[PDB]
Amino acid sequence: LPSGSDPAFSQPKSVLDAGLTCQGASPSSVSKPILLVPGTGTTGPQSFDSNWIPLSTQLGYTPCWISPPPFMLNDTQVNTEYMVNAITALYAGSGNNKLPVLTWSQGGLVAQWGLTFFPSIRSKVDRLMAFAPDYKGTVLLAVSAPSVWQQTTGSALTTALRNAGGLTQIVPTTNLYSATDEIVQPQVSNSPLDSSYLFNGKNVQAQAVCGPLFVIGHAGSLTSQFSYVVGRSALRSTTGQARSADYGITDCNPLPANDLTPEQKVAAAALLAPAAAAIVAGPKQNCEPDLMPYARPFAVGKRTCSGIVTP
Amino acid sequence: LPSGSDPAFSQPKSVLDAGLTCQGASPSSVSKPILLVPGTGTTGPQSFDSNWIPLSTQLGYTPCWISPPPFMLNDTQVNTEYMVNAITALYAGSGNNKLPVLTWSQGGLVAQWGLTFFPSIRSKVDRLMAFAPDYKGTVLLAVSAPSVWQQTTGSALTTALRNAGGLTQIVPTTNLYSATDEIVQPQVSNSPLDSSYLFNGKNVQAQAVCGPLFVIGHAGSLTSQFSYVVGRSALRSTTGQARSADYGITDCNPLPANDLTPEQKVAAAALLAPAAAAIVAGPKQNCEPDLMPYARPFAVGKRTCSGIVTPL
């Protein structure tokens, strides 16, 4: 794992601060923060208003989130600056106390990128609860957002993360995912081949618990009652990871979490709607963004927009 | 299954006609029409603009579509009136020549409901090519759209379709679906248990051809290169069904169909975006629409808005 000083941010702190919001609180003075990191093509409220914002509130947290512009479609390394800055801020703002991080989709990749390349936050993140994270990207053009390139399997970014040690958990981590995910694949093996899998992680493939007939998609992986039970377990556990004893067959409910209002359940079902729209309307290019200098040593030989990464 | 006279429409014909559009042609005078029936929470153009409209155009058809208001969220029985009327009108408008129906999602349920309960179109539909149809609805709502009620497994509508013999093919039918469909389940068995399966149909579960490792979603079931090859097979086939010799493992590309222009591939992935939005902003009720008298005998004992379904 990389060590020593954090790399410099490409953005000034003021820009990164602008991406962070807490519910009814400022990041500098907040009780029991939980940092929520959104999915591709979404803002924090778009990913989480219908699910983990109100669910984490009922568990006694103050939900906070980042919304890197535009809708997480920009370079993943920049999205990660928002997350690293947010941890530094929320840690300092909650009495120098560790805080949990809860993510969806690209949000997990961002969290793990942050923990891999910015050592200062390793002591500040209590645990990670990632829903449908794509640490290996996805195998599922020239019409793609910067972060979609980086989330493509075999990308320079995913290569760098793996070579820097980022496929092993860095803090206590729970990963919840589905073999049937229609966005992130491969996920079928219930093993280290899966994109959501981290070594030493509590890797919960829904089919392993619920059976080989069980089906939930990419959005359900975040919003389901099953996901809530696993999520709650992870957040509550004294080990930092979800505990097998806290869930089972009877929790295998693929539909939106029971504690959500009827309105929130409908909105949770529609989770991927603004994401597709933002991708259609968003930035697109025909190459993968260059790696920042701190990441380049870990993907030598990969091709990005400027050319081949050199030693 | 039902035999005899078509039931009467609840909607005026002119209202039904207004929901029907053909590309660069009037339904009254069209050559080589294909009737496209959209998914829940979409219009015809929203379901097919980025896929089967230009692909059927490139295969030598005039794409026509119904867009039952509002966005296929109304009673599925009313949506079917649009389809049945469109068949009658497109059959007449093409010089009394049979036409193929191509569907996504609820559109397939609509097609089969039509063929089940309106006998006159049975002789007018050449074939059905249904992508991710939900004939048994889905196991995946007190504020839900009328058609969302009806597409829930165990609904009075799905009960009525089944008991009227509608889970057996009526015209030559191909059903292309995926075990991993995130909207329509169950689809996992490669067998009659699957929501997309019709007896005697050409039932193509993606994983049966592409392996148990193959994953494709509800939208991809319509838009993919794999789906295009299977669809092209069904349309061109002399039997009215897709032929196994026309596709294989090398066609197992889950990404948007190759022939599509670069902008059409982009919009293909965003297929469910208007759908999920319209569901939020459309009609909603706390009960399943009542079955129209022609369908009611097949779901006696079920519950709809007016209460328990009883014999007429």
Side-chain angles (χ1 to χ4, degrees), chain A, chain B residues 2-312:
Chain A
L1 218 46
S3 56
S5 298
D6 283 9
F9 289 142
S10 74
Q11 306 309 298
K13 182 168 160 54
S14 58
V15 173
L16 306 175
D17 284 347
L20 170 66
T21 310
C22 292
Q23 178 177 272
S26 185
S28 45
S29 182
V30 60
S31 181
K32 305 253 70 207
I34 177 164
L35 181 58
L36 304 179
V37 190
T40 312
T42 73
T43 67
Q46 286 171 338
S47 276
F48 302 114
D49 275 353
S50 72
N51 53 82
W52 286 97
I53 289 173
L55 295 166
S56 69
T57 303
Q58 76 166 232
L59 292 176
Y61 299 87
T62 304
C64 304
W65 52 89
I66 54 167
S67 302
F71 312 101
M72 294 283 289
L73 304 167
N74 190 28
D75 174 1
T76 292
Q77 302 164 112
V78 179
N79 299 346
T80 300
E81 294 182 18
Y82 282 90
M83 204 217 60
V84 177
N85 181 74
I87 295 299
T88 299
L90 293 166
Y91 181 86
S94 58
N96 292 335
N97 279 295
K98 301 176 197 178
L99 55 143
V101 178
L102 188 150
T103 72
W104 180 50
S105 180
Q106 191 197 158
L109 177 59
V110 162
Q112 193 61 2
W113 191 265
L115 290 157
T116 299
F117 292 111
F118 297 77
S120 79
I121 62 157
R122 297 177 186 156
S123 56
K124 296 177 175 176
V125 179
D126 203 40
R127 68 197 71 209
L128 174 64
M129 176 61 256
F131 299 95
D134 56 337
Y135 306 117
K136 288 203 254 307
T138 181
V139 291
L140 287 176
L141 289 163
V143 41
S144 314
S147 73
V148 176
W149 277 98
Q150 299 170 304
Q151 287 174 91
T152 299
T153 294
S155 66
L157 186 122
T158 55
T159 296
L161 179 64
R162 165 169 38 65
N163 287 332
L167 291 194
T168 300
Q169 83 166 15
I170 295 157
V171 300
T173 302
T174 304
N175 297 301
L176 186 277
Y177 69 104
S178 176
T180 67
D181 193 310
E182 82 281 3
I183 304 303
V184 175
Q185 285 296 325
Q187 299 274 60
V188 292
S189 67
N190 184 213
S191 85
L193 295 176
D194 301 342
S195 190
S196 288
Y197 187 108
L198 293 179
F199 292 109
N200 307 322
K202 181 64 172 171
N203 302 293
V204 188
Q205 186 212 59
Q207 290 71 19
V209 177
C210 302
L213 301 172
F214 189 82
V215 174
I216 66 296
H218 189 62
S221 295
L222 179 68
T223 68
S224 72
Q225 173 60 27
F226 182 72
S227 306
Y228 175 68
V229 180
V230 178
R232 177 181 66 178
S233 177
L235 295 177
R236 202 148 276 174
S237 169
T238 54
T239 71
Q241 290 180 324
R243 302 182 174 117
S244 293
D246 294 339
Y247 57 87
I249 269 295
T250 56
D251 299 301
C252 292
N253 178 1
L255 310 174
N258 296 156
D259 290 330
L260 301 165
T261 68
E263 187 161 28
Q264 286 159 349
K265 291 192 191 192
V266 181
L271 204 76
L272 283 170
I279 290 160
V280 168
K284 301 175 201 80
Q285 60 194 57
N286 72 350
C287 54
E288 184 181 354
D290 298 332
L291 290 175
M292 271 159 197
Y294 68 74
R296 282 177 213 188
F298 303 102
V300 178
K302 299 302 286 185
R303 184 204 276 276
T304 56
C305 292
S306 302
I308 304 308
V309 181
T310 55
Chain B
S3 60
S5 308
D6 282 12
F9 288 148
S10 65
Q11 313 297 295
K13 174 162 182 292
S14 55
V15 178
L16 298 178
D17 287 337
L20 169 67
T21 306
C22 291
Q23 187 184 253
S26 180
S28 59
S29 180
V30 66
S31 169
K32 203 70 161 306
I34 186 142
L35 178 65
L36 305 175
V37 186
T40 312
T42 72
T43 59
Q46 282 169 339
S47 275
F48 306 108
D49 270 345
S50 62
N51 48 85
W52 283 103
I53 287 171
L55 292 167
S56 65
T57 299
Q58 283 165 22
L59 288 162
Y61 298 90
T62 300
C64 306
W65 54 84
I66 52 165
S67 300
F71 303 97
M72 291 283 289
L73 299 170
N74 195 15
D75 182 353
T76 291
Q77 291 161 127
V78 171
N79 299 345
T80 300
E81 294 188 16
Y82 283 89
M83 197 217 57
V84 171
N85 180 71
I87 292 154
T88 301
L90 293 172
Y91 180 87
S94 53
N96 281 201
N97 302 324
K98 283 185 179 180
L99 58 144
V101 186
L102 186 151
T103 72
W104 183 46
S105 189
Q106 181 199 168
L109 177 60
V110 166
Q112 189 70 357
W113 191 266
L115 294 156
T116 296
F117 291 114
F118 297 76
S120 76
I121 59 157
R122 295 179 185 159
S123 54
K124 293 177 178 182
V125 177
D126 197 37
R127 68 198 70 210
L128 177 60
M129 173 65 258
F131 297 98
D134 59 337
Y135 304 119
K136 299 179 172 70
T138 184
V139 299
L140 298 168
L141 20 71
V143 216
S144 280
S147 70
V148 165
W149 277 96
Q150 291 162 318
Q151 296 174 84
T152 312
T153 298
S155 63
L157 184 131
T158 56
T159 299
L161 183 62
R162 189 180 65 240
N163 293 331
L167 305 191
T168 296
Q169 81 161 14
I170 301 165
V171 299
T173 300
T174 309
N175 298 302
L176 191 283
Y177 66 106
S178 173
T180 66
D181 194 313
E182 82 284 8
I183 301 301
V184 175
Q185 289 293 322
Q187 300 277 57
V188 294
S189 79
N190 188 215
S191 92
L193 298 179
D194 300 337
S195 186
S196 294
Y197 190 108
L198 291 176
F199 292 105
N200 299 326
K202 186 61 172 185
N203 301 295
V204 191
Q205 192 213 54
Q207 289 76 20
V209 185
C210 302
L213 285 134
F214 190 76
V215 170
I216 196 170
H218 189 63
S221 291
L222 180 69
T223 61
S224 70
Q225 178 53 33
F226 183 65
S227 303
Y228 173 75
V229 175
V230 174
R232 186 181 64 180
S233 185
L235 296 179
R236 287 273 156 174
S237 171
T238 137
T239 70
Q241 294 179 334
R243 298 186 296 103
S244 280
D246 293 334
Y247 60 91
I249 70 286
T250 57
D251 295 301
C252 296
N253 173 14
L255 305 183
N258 293 143
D259 283 327
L260 293 170
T261 58
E263 204 192 301
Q264 284 161 356
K265 291 187 185 177
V266 196
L271 216 66
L272 274 306
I279 294 168
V280 175
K284 294 193 207 72
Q285 57 199 58
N286 71 352
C287 54
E288 178 179 1
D290 292 337
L291 290 174
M292 273 162 194
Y294 67 78
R296 216 176 285 164
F298 306 97
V300 175
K302 306 299 287 183
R303 168 180 269 90
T304 58
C305 296
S306 291
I308 310 313
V309 177
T310 54
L312 311 174

